[model samples]
Target: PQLLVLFGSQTGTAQDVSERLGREARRRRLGCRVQALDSYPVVNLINEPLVIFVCATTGQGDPPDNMKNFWRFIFRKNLPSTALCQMDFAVLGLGDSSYAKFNFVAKKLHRRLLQLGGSALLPVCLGDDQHELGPDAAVDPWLRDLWDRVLGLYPPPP
Candidate 1:
């Protein structure tokens, strides 16, 4: 199964990270695609075997503008709780610890996905902007573990 990487960012960090992950997946011969959450078709969520979400919390724990509509659709009352039962996903949140709700958007996404019956492939990964080197400090390690787990699940083609 292919991996679908989606991102929601107020700035460009989440998008950069998702694209970098997509490139790495290609290098490793893993099938993957990356897109902004706003552009991704919500109908495809149920069909995905694996998905990765990279989101940033902007302005007082709010989701980025790009993810606002996506969030609204997923939380619709008409949407069934089991809508994503067949899907597995991981969340990567980028935020500044200086904020009262660091990584809040990603956290909410993780919880909401679980509530919709989607399984988690790993614990949520939080990238903190407080790091001297930037969010990459956290992103790098989390991605290492993520790739390790994914490689075990879907071995690279020879």
Candidate 2:
């Protein structure tokens, strides 16, 4: 089984983070694949056993431009909810907390995924760009926690 890393980025911060996560996972000998949101078939995401969605909300709490269609498809009533039930996933969101909708996209996605019968590998990771200290600071610890849990669940390359 391969871990699928899908990233949605605006200014590239999330993409950079996703790449780092992939590199770290590979270095730790984890088996996985990584791709940008624009490159992946959001509708076909059900095929993966494990998935990581790294996304950044655009201004005013909007999904990244690349993910708009993807979200539309997933949220559509016609799509099979069970298509994602077999998968375990997590989301990492980037946003400017100063906005009223800060991390709104992430929260919405997390809630919707669960409502659709998907499981979370970790609590959604939110990175706010408004803080003076920088919002992405939370990402490191979150990823560490994720790594430990995933390693325990999947073990090393067999």
Candidate 3:
């Protein structure tokens, strides 16, 4: 299984998180690819074996500017239910708790992937910037457990 980490950021936090995820994957001797959400071709996503997403909330719970086209492509209702059946994924979202619709884009994306038959590697993680330490507080714990789930999904060898 291949590992791909994609991030959408309005203010660059998501990009930092995505890089952290890649660095950690490297620490575990795992080969991974990190890219902007828009950098990856959406069509190939259906064939990927493993993927991770980090999305930052923008105006009114919207996805970042870089993610718009990819987001729209994936939300197509005409796509087959089994379009992503061969894949597995995880998502992390960054948003301030003050918003009534905090992390809405990530939540919806997570659900949409599931609906398209992608197996989830872990529960969706919604990071809160309202924390005394900001979203890093939530992100660290979620990241701590991410390796275990990733290894479970794509063990290199015994």
State the lDDT of candidate 1 residue by residue for 1-158, as single tens digits: 57899999988989999989989898888889899998999888999989999999999899899989998888787778898999888999999889999999999999999999999988888899898978988899999999888887787567
Error of 3 at 41 (Å): 1.0
After superposition, the stretches of candidate 3 with alpha carbons farther than 4 Å from their true spots are none
Estimate candidate 3's RMSD in Å: 1.2
Q: Pick the candidate with the highest TM-score.
A: 3
lDDT per residue as tens, model 2, 36-84: 7777877677767788888888877788877777777667876656667
Top candidate by lDDT: 1
- The residue ranges of model 2 lying beyond 4 angstroms of the native Cα positions read none
| TM-score for each predicted model, relative to the true structure | 0.94, 0.90, 0.95
Locate the minimum summed-lDDT window of 10 residues in model 2.
128-137
Task: Count clashing pairs, candidate 3.
Answer: 0
